[PDB]
Structure formats: C-alpha cells, structure tokens
Amino acid sequence: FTLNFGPQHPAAHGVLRLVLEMNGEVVERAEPHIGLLHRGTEKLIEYKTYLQALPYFDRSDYVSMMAQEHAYSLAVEKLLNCEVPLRAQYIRVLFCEITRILNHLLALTTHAMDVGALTPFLWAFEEREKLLEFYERVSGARMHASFIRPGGVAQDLPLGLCRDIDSFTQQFASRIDELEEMLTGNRIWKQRLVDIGTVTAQQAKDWGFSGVMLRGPGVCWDLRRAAPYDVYDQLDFDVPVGTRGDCYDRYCIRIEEMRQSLRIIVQCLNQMPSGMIKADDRKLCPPSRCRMKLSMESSIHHFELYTEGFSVPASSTYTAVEAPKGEFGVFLVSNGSNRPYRCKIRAPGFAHLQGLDFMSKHHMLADVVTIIGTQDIVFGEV
Amino acid sequence: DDEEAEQLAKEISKDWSTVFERSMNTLFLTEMVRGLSLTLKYFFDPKVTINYPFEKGPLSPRFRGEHALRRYPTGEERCIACKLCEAVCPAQAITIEAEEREDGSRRTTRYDIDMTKCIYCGFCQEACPVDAIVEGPNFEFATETHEELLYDKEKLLENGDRWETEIAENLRSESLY
Amino acid sequence: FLVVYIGAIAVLFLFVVMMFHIQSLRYTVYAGKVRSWTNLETLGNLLYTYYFVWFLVPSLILLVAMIGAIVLTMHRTTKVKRQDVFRRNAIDFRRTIM
C-alpha cells in the first residue's frame, strides 16, 4: 500500500516528497524523493570564482547559514595555505556557534511543531530573530550573510556587537530552559519521541550519519573534538552524546548542544584578540576600501580579487566541519584556475535522509514526521 | 535484552515513597502542569511583536537591501564603467555597457541590475572602487509586475539620490570597516 | 434506542456497508403525583435490587459478547497468532532433507 506522504506543514519542510509503502498504519518502507530542491549548485560553482562561489554555501543549508561558508572557507584555505588571524578564527567560531544555536533553535522547535507543540516554535523564533540581529548587524543580510570569506572573514564586527551578544548569552540559558521545560518533561513528548527512530551505532556509521545522529547512538564523534578546525582546540565545551539513539536522545543532545554552543559563544566573547580581521596576504584577501583607494598596489589586488580571484593552486581536499546538521564537508577539487573544479558538497541530510528508510520502518505513519524532524532534514543540502 | 533492560529500569524505581512519587507525577499530570504554568507566564508577559507598517525591525548600516547607484555630491554619476561589479556579481544581475560621453569621461550607457536575478550579497558594493553601487536600506520595493523589478539602466538605480541621505550616513558609519 | 441502536448498532451496520460492500371524563387521582418518579428512578428501584439476577445475567451476556468479539475478530492480529512463526532447529533438516 503506497502513500504519497508530502510536505505536511509547508514552509517548515519544504519539498519533502516521501513515497511511503505502508502496512495499515505501520510503515514498511519510506522512499524519499530528492531533486525537488536540486538547484544546480554543484554545477554553478564550477562556473564562478572562489569568491562568487561563497554565497551558494549560505544557501546550501538555509537554517544554519554561516556553518557552510565556514566549511567552504576552510576548503579554500586548506589549498591556499592561507593562515587567518586569531580574531578571524574567534569571530568565525562565534558565528559558526551562533549558527549552531540558530539551527538547533529551528530544528528543535520546527520538529516540535511537526510533533504538535506550537509554542516552542514561536519562542525559539523570537530567539532566532534576536540572533539575526547579529547576523544582519555583522554582515548585512539576516539569513544569507556572505560573511566568512576564504581569507579570514568579510569585515570586522561593529563596535557594539560583543556587548549585545553578551546581553543575549546571559538571557539564553533561560530560553533553552523554557524550550526544555515545555518539551523535555512532557509525557506527550517522551511518548512521541522515546524509542522513535532508534539508530544502533553500527547503522549510524554505515549510513554515514556523522552529526547529532552519530552522537545519539553513542559514537563520541564531533569534528570539533576530532579535527579541531579553529580555536576549538582552545575553547572548552563538552559534546553531549546519547545513550539510546532514539529521537528523544537526539532532542536532548540538540538541547544540550544548544548550551555548549552557549559556552563557546561566551568564551569567544570573553577571549577575542584585537587583531587583523582578514589574512594579511592581500592576494587572497581584498584590501580594505581605505587602502585600495590610497595604495596603487592594493587597488590592483582589489581589482584582480573581485574580478579574477585567487587562483588557488591545483589540489583536491575534503574539508569537513561540524555543521549543525552534521558533518558538512565540501570536497573541493581545484584546477589551478581562479574557478573551482567540481566543488562537491557532502551535505548531511543527503546521508541522513537516506536513514529515513530504515529509521522509520515499522514506525507509525505519524512518526514519519518525527523522524524527518530529528534528522534536521533541510532540502537545500539534498 | 530490551526485556531485561525494562525489568531493570523498572527495578531502579522500586522503593515505596518513590513509586508513590512517580505515581503522583504521572497521575496528577505534574510534568504537564509545569508546561501549563510556563505557558501562562508567557500568556501574561509583554508580547515581542511589531505592528509592522508603523514600526519596523532593527537593521544595521551594513544591511543589504535595494541597490542604488550613488552620485558624487556635485552630480556626476559616481559609476565610472569599470564593470568590476558586473564581474563580481555571482548571479550576473548587472549588465553594464560603457561609452565615452561627449565630456570625454567614461560612463555607463547601460547599468541594469536585474533585482529578480540578484542575490543581494553586497559583492557589488565591495567590488565597486568609488562606492558607485551601494545597497540602500530600502528592502521595501515589492513590485506588482516582474518587468518593473528589473531595475533599468542607470535611471531607477539613480533613485538612490533620494536614499543618499541614508546611504551617505550608512557609508560614513561603515567606512571605518 | 438512540444511543445503543443508532450510535452503536447501526454504526456497526454502516461499517458493514461501507467496507465489505455487498454488491373530559378523566378523574386524575392527585395521589401518586406528589412524588413523580422519573423513568430511570422507577427502573432502578427494580432492576438492581428485586430483579437483579436478570440484570447480572445480561452482565454475563455482555461479557460473552466481549469474549466473542475478541475470539472472533481478533483476526490473528495479536497473541492469537502474533506469538511467533515458531521454529525448532534439532528436528529441522537444515538442507539434509528438502
């Protein structure tokens, strides 16, 4: 018995087009259909410079924007050998972590709105509209902040942003507590989530989950502890790791990972060195407006970096960061030219949404939206 | 194993005046009355809402909204036709054609940003050498018809003169970065 | 009649159709009106105390209806057959006999 389970609530899971082969109410197999959001991203990037390539990444995962620009930047610094300053690293993490918070605040309470709890959605989205007052203030666009450029980061924080991020972090433990007091204790929540989509660790490894769905099963594997790719080796934070694997562990993790991300934000705030914002290598970082206008040699680079590009040397690397969805890695083959060459984007949600087939076997049809909830399936990456 | 796991996870809470605690917190729905109480606290608290048309959400001088071609204080469009923004544009929205005007100084005969084919990433504002193209904080230009949304060659992007009073302010405050 | 006929029994029958389609001079005596007994009260004054065994026997008939609807329409959907497929290794040929 085949059922074309589509997007239950649009605007939350946009193009979800599962084709469930059911058995009464018990689902026997879930066959997701991809491509409804397949923009030509892995082709369009081959046609544009390494700078023009960056805006696609904030548009790859639309609920955790800067994590993908941070995964791309670290793939055009893996090749460029472009050492970025300490302040660029600290800002880059303070925003990758603000993005982890922006994602878990959505991927928890959009999940909690698919399950049925209507209010956590709107509380978490007031919180997200506080964090977009930081995105929009530091770069310009509330969602797609093309801000974490290859060398360092686009431009320094405004002169009042750390004070505001602090005044937000002080009041954010309470918001997590409310999102938690409203959902963690509920017997209507546990019942809707405990023993739902349980993934034994061998399955989370096999299906390349590598995210909050690889730390549910108990595999202690965070690419901020495994492969520290910034000040992360300096910052202190504990990676919460589940013990059962059910969608109630992944929720409890995403609601603790939203507190450890608060620890990382507070650290990045309390220790942010007053250094240069971009790599001093002005052939990888366009010089400031003031310098390119006054200096002829800076003007030449501002011209050959906003038209030509880097021309990062010939290589091929797989740089993977811990994006909120999971291990978002961008395999970036680079022909010597200024344009990338098959900038393949390993995006979790392409490996997670595979897991829907075995996660939601023998679960009731109303659980198939809870699974899609805890996978944090955002179809931009799929 | 799940059978033994159940037996043990239920033999953990197996001492009187603990079975009673759990029974009175699953019968007098007590986890749920802490949900209702929080929900009430938020029912009575002030509302984080904004009656939009009259007051609008906070922005920043770096905010990227409607593209505006700036002008030099003494008229003279700031847009010398280098085509750097036409080059840097990721979506290739800007189409620039250049002609030595009769005065002799280069200028763009055609400077058409296609707003629909535009990602509002501010690359044009960065790439332009003289700050000729900047994004005005407008962001309120929803058009009834698509053809209007294609911003014509240097005529509608020349409406930035109205927004110059705010664009000059944002630039005077952002240029420090 | 409303409840236990057109909210239960003809509900059953509707299910069996939808699925499984077939293809002046009175002298009112003002005594005994001083305390008017509603029909429920004057059925309960009897059914539960005086003729109570004809009420515990319909109890057994409702219990037999429960047992019957269970043993009939469990439809091998629970321990009736959801016990297991059942298998024994020692007797099993395991490729010795096909």
Partner: peptide, 24 residues
C-alpha cells in the same frame, strides 16, 4: 501487526558528555 511497537520505557535521563571534561 507484529511490528515492533515503540516502547516508551527507557533508562532515566543522565547527561552523558565525553571524557574530555577536565583534562581531555
């Protein structure tokens, strides 16, 4: 249906960090 029902019993909540709390 013999499908495995979602048993809503489990072990009690105990926040499980990684071993790198104090000294890696």
């Amino acid at each position: 249906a013999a499908a495995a029902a979602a048993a809503a019993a489990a072990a009690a909540a105990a926040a499980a960090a990684a071993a790198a709390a104090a000294a890696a």
